[PDB]
Design an enzyme around this catalytic site. Structure first.
Site, PDB file in Angstrom:
ATOM      1  N   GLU A  55      20.224 -27.400 -33.951  1.00 39.35           N
ATOM      2  CA  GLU A  55      21.440 -27.318 -34.752  1.00 39.35           C
ATOM      3  C   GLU A  55      22.305 -27.549 -35.892  1.00 39.35           C
ATOM      4  OE1 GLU A  55      22.655 -31.707 -33.657  1.00 39.35           O
ATOM      5  OE2 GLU A  55      25.017 -31.710 -34.460  1.00 39.35           O
ATOM      6  N   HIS A  56      20.853 -27.065 -36.767  1.00 40.44           N
ATOM      7  CA  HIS A  56      21.821 -26.849 -37.641  1.00 40.44           C
ATOM      8  C   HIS A  56      21.605 -25.482 -38.163  1.00 40.44           C
ATOM      9  CE1 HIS A  56      22.255 -30.618 -40.458  1.00 40.44           C
ATOM     10  NE2 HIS A  56      21.535 -31.353 -39.695  1.00 40.44           N
ATOM     11  N   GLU A  63      19.003 -34.873 -46.345  1.00 43.29           N
ATOM     12  CA  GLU A  63      18.975 -35.786 -45.416  1.00 43.29           C
ATOM     13  C   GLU A  63      18.780 -36.990 -45.262  1.00 43.29           C
ATOM     14  OE1 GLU A  63      20.251 -33.161 -41.952  1.00 43.29           O
ATOM     15  OE2 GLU A  63      22.212 -32.097 -43.289  1.00 43.29           O
TER      16      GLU A  63
END
Ligand code: HEM
Ligand code: HEM
Lengths: 444, 57, 285, 64, 108, 48
Positions: free
Chosen positions: A59-60, A136
């Protein structure tokens, strides 16, 4: 008036299937603003321990370039057309959608295809995103509620990959290569299991035409029979606690069994969550609230906040409570929580079930507003039912609920179950697990 | 053990059925243990007690 | 108050609006600490008297018809400024490894093509990211800062619009010893845009951005309720979005250049908060 | 529609319901291919040292 | 909230018996205090039955004890229970004292 | 907390919740029946 006719006047989701096993669904409405999304059944539940955190990293790197328009042409064109791109991935599902206008639609679908299937992967990208995603994880070691859910799933589904988080452990993330991500893309993002669903001012045959251009001619072809299937997950039922005495508040979650998706037990437990559900300390009229748990928690100032909630998964789920409180009122909060539960179980009366029916109707209608939540419910319903059941039948299944079936389900799923108890913070005055199990039913 | 499952589902759910079960079982256990006690006590000696020379006399 | 001001940005907004007005737009949305428990019911009664009049009431209904709501409003409603620009700065030492600097001048009133020009101007300078976890391929402020400082930052435009006046500017969430290069790079980027370096496809892309943001602002029916009510009470009556969007994308580029010239050449106000050990104050700006 | 066939020290699990032949990993297919390679090499050298008409005697199994 | 936490009897019973913070690494040596309490109430009960059948008169004391042991129903088991319960009371007593000196709780 | 999952309890569990594919639904009834049968038998003995 004509509210029953208004539920009859709800528009219908035209659902069809494209030839590569593609599941397409549409709501053709009167809004020029539209939302187009792709839903994928590939979460962390299909990942292993050496494959954990795959879909999150995909997704990133789904947005950070491709073989067609590399690096920044994608973002430049989308921001040149004013559309808003959004994405999330869970343990079970992963969604990519675009909120745009009716005259930006074919470029949106084409770039959506270019995002999904044509993901090229460099090595500066994997280095950079590795560093930033570890940052993150370092920053989201502070947001307490997601840590509580991760502890709860990890102690609840011990052994199955449902206990894993979406991001997984950091150590497997910081050591992968291109090859395992390539295997993830080749094995999981497959045309038979993906759903294209859209809502807004656009024709069903128009979206059929756009799918016939772009999404006709996808992969549609598996590897050497290496296909995932939902193994029945083993809910153990146990407790984890993370004592750390430098925090101002404490977070305690408790959960019991799930209904899954198919049975109307899910409807009855949503009636139960409409009975209790959420409370935050930024409200008004606290000394006169309807839910008696909220009445006691205002009148004696038990917690900061609570919510009693549902989470569902494939043939399973977790059902229960999460509350934020000071360390000096954990015991009374848990005592009154067990009291409210057993009052629902043994004494399912009239007005509480009436209020639960009205609150669940209100919760469903308030959930269905905006193009994005409606299309999201469409996509996740078609990945959990094979159909978008319309709201009139929803109202029928709500209207087929009485307090007798309520206390049947409450005897089935609350009366002396083996819980999952996750404690985080200054949790010295957490009651003991055997005392909580003894308090799961009072004989008098 | 499937028979134990319906045993749980019949006689261990509520308090009233559980209490009636343990009371009736306590009376039948009284009955059975007193009969077993009489049997073992008048079975171990067989040449001393009051029974045989209270019917022969 | 604790729940609201757990974020620094609320302090940024409130001290910014305290920093731009000598008057009624510098009031707070929240009660100060010393006023707690020191209120009267008398001021509440007088406020109910001379503020809740029949002249200042907008009743909008989405889901009910006209005459029923009209008749209820007839039966149960029988009961009957010009904030000046302050100019300057507000500096608060807060020290949380997040230097917050909002740089704001005065722009325009509400409901005008000039307000549309300021909206086009902030869509040129940069808005919220269209892509979640994206990399902002349009904002030249973002590109000039990322050229300058290789730290995680936040540069965002800002446009508050009001009846008598209105505020425009930008805002930086930056490092402790890396704030001034970010702020001055954004300042000289706005200066070289205000010189007359404006791109017509960037103008059309900003038109796409503003049209898309205004159409996505009425996705929620409560948001559409908000738009209809504020428009019918602000400008007298509602106008459908067709000609409104037409006047949105019918603005000119010289409006944008003159608006940026008004912003830079006008006297600035600012709100600075945090560990401000390397913050350019005024004359360095 | 069955008690799902418990395995035991006599109850040999048949190759129909494993059920580990459902969520097959690609590395498990690679392990099957390596197993095929091992059996291929061993039967290859068996047929080398077995069909020789010049050879006379026994096969000389090292594993036995 | 709780009847146990607002009623004044159950406050003392809760802070002494239910929610009493006790350590967790305890073997059978800390059972002896509760056993002394059980022997206390048991010996009081047996002595109560004895005092309902005993006379303290030196002419009739021995015959009264014999009347308890023979004529009174189960007075023999109650007499033996009182005597041997006193004996086991001393057993638990010296075990409790030996524990209190051995693990070193005599600092209190 | 991402690096935090459980150690195994395969040394301790009953054989019904031993395999990681068998559900906990049917394994609840006989387990509860065995334990509560022990408690009820203890109760009858103490009461008699
Ligand atoms: C008269 C009979 C006695 C009774 C009924 C009695 C009762 C109790 C009880 C109920 C406890 C707490 C539970 C336990 O630790 O076993 C206790 C603990 C204790 N008792 Fe006594 N006790 C008696 C005699 C004594 C004597 C003679 C001493 C020595 C001076 C003593 C010293 C202690 C100590 C030091 C503890 C704490 C032991 C520890 O924390 O490990 N007790 N007693
Ligand atoms: C206040 C309650 C008590 C009463 C009314 C009571 C009453 C009596 C009586 C009437 C006797 C003489 C009959 C007999 O010997 O069996 C007796 C004996 C005795 N009592 Fe108690 N008693 C009490 C408490 C205790 C306690 C707390 C102890 C110590 C654990 C104790 C230890 C003994 C002993 C050792 C004898 C002598 C037993 C024998 O020689 O047969 N008594 N008691």
């Amino acid at each position: 008036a004509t509210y029953a006719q208004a539920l009859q006047s709800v528009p219908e989701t035209q659902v069809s299937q494209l030839d590569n096993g593609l599941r397409v669904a549409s709501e053709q409405s009167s809004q020029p603003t539209c939302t187009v999304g792709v839903w994928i059944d590939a979460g962390s539940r299909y990942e292993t321990e050496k494959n954990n955190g795959a879909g999150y990293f995909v997704e990133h790197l789904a947005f950070k370039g491709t073989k067609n328009r590399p690096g920044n042409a994608l973002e430049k064109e989308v921001e040149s057309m004013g559309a808003h791109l959004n994405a999330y991935s869970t343990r079970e599902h992963t969604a990519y959608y675009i909120k745009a206008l009716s005259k930006d639609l074919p470029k949106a679908v084409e770039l959506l295809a270019d995002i999904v299937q044509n993901c090229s992967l460099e090595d500066s990208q994997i280095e950079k995103e590795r560093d930033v995603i570890l940052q993150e994880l370092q920053e989201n070691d502070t947001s307490m509620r997601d840590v509580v859910f991760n502890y709860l799933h990890a102690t609840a589904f011990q052994g199955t990959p449902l206990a894993q988080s979406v991001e997984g452990p950091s150590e497997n993330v910081r050591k992968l290569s291109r090859a395992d991500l390539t295997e993830y893309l080749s094995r999981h993002y497959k045309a038979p299991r993906m759903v294209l669903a859209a809502a807004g001012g656009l024709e069903h045959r128009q979206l059929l035409d756009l799918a016939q251009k772009h999404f006709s001619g996808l992969s549609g072809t598996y590897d050497e029979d290496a296909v995932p299937t939902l193994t029945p997950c083993r809910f153990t039922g146990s407790e984890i606690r993370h004592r750390e005495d430098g925090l101002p508040l404490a977070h305690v979650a408790i959960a019991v069994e799930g209904p899954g998706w198919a049975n109307p037990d899910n409807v009855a437990l949503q009636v139960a969550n409409a009975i209790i559900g959420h409370y935050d300390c930024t409200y008004g009229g606290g000394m006169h609230l309807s839910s008696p748990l909220a009445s006691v928690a205002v009148t004696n100032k038990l917690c900061q906040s609570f919510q009693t909630f549902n989470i569902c998964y494939a043939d399973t789920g977790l059902l229960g409570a999460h509350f934020v409180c000071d360390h000096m009122s954990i015991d009374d909060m848990m005592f009154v929580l067990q009291g409210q539960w057993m009052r629902l179980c043994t004494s399912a009366t009239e007005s509480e079930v009436v209020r639960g029916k009205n609150l669940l109707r209100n919760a469903l209608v308030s959930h269905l507003d905006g193009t994005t939540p409606v299309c999201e419910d469409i996509g996740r319903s078609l990945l959990t039912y094979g159909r978008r059941i319309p709201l009139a039948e929803w109202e029928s299944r709500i209207a087929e609920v009485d307090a007798r079936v309520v206390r049947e389900v409450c005897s089935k799923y609350f009366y002396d179950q083996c819980p999952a108890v996750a404690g985080f913070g200054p949790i010295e005055q957490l009651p003991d697990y055997n005392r909580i199990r003894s308090g799961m039913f009072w004989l008098r | 053990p499937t028979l134990t499952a319906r045993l749980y589902s019949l006689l261990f759910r509520r308090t009233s059925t559980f209490a009636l079960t343990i009371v009736v079982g306590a009376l039948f256990f009284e009955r059975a243990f007193d009969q077993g006690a009489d049997a073992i006590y008048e079975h171990i000696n067989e040449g001393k007690l009051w029974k045989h020379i209270k019917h022969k006399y | 108050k604790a729940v609201a001001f757990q974020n620094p940005q609320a302090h940024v907004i409130e001290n910014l609006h305290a920093a731009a007005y000598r008057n009624a737009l510098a009031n707070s949305l929240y009660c100060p600490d010393y006023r707690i428990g020191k209120v009267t019911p008398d001021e509440l009664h007088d406020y109910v008297q001379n503020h809740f009049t029949s002249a200042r009431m907008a009743l909008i209904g989405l889901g009910v018809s006209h005459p029923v709501l009209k008749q209820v409003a007839e039966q149960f409603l029988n009961i009957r400024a010009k904030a000046k620009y302050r100019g300057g700065e507000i500096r608060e030492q807060n020290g949380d490894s997040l230097v917050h600097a909002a740089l704001v001048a005065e722009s325009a009133a509400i409901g005008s093509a000039e307000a549309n020009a300021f909206s086009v101007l902030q869509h040129v300078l940069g808005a919220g990211p269209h892509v979640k976890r994206g990399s902002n391929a349009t904002s030249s402020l973002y590109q000039a800062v990322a050229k300058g400082v290789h730290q995680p930052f936040d540069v965002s435009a800002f446009n508050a619009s009001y009846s008598d006046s209105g505020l425009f500017g930008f805002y930086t969430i930056s490092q402790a010893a890396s704030a001034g290069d970010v702020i001055k790079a954004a300042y000289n980027q706005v200066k070289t845009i205000a010189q007359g370096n404006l791109s017509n496809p960037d103008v059309q892309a900003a038109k796409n951005k503003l049209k898309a943001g205004y159409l996505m602002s009425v996705e929620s029916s409560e948001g559409f309720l908000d738009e209809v009510g504020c428009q019918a009470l602000a400008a007298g009556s509602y106008t459908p979005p067709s000609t409104v969007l037409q006047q949105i994308d019918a603005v000119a580029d010289a409006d944008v250049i003159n608006a940026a010239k008004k912003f830079v050449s006008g006297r600035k106000s600012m709100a600075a908060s945090g560990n401000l050990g390397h913050t350019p104050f005024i004359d360095e700006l | 529609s069955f008690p799902k066939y418990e395995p035991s020290r006599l109850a040999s699990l048949p190759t129909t319901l494993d059920p580990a032949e459902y969520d097959i990993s690609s590395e498990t297919r690679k392990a099957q291919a390596e197993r095929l390679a091992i059996r291929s090499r061993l039967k290859r050298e068996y047929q080398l040292q077995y069909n020789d008409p010049s050879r006379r005697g026994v096969v000389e199994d090292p594993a036995l | 909230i709780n009847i146990r936490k607002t009623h004044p009897l159950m406050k003392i019973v809760n802070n002494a018996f239910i929610d009493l913070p006790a350590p967790s690494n305890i073997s059978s040596w800390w059972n002896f205090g509760s056993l002394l309490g059980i022997c206390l109430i048991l010996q009081i009960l047996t002595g109560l039955f004895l005092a309902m059948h005993y006379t303290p008169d030196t002419t009739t004391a021995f015959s009264s004890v014999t009347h308890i042991c023979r004529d009174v129903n189960y007075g023999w088991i109650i007499r033996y229970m009182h005597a041997n319960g006193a004996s086991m009371f001393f057993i638990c007593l010296f075990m409790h004292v030996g524990r209190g000196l051995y693990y070193g709780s005599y600092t209190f | 907390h991402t690096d935090i999952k459980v150690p195994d309890f395969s040394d301790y569990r009953r054989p019904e919740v031993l395999d990681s594919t068998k559900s906990s639904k049917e394994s609840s009834e006989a387990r509860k029946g065995f334990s509560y049968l022990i408690t009820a038998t203890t109760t009858v003995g103490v009461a008699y």
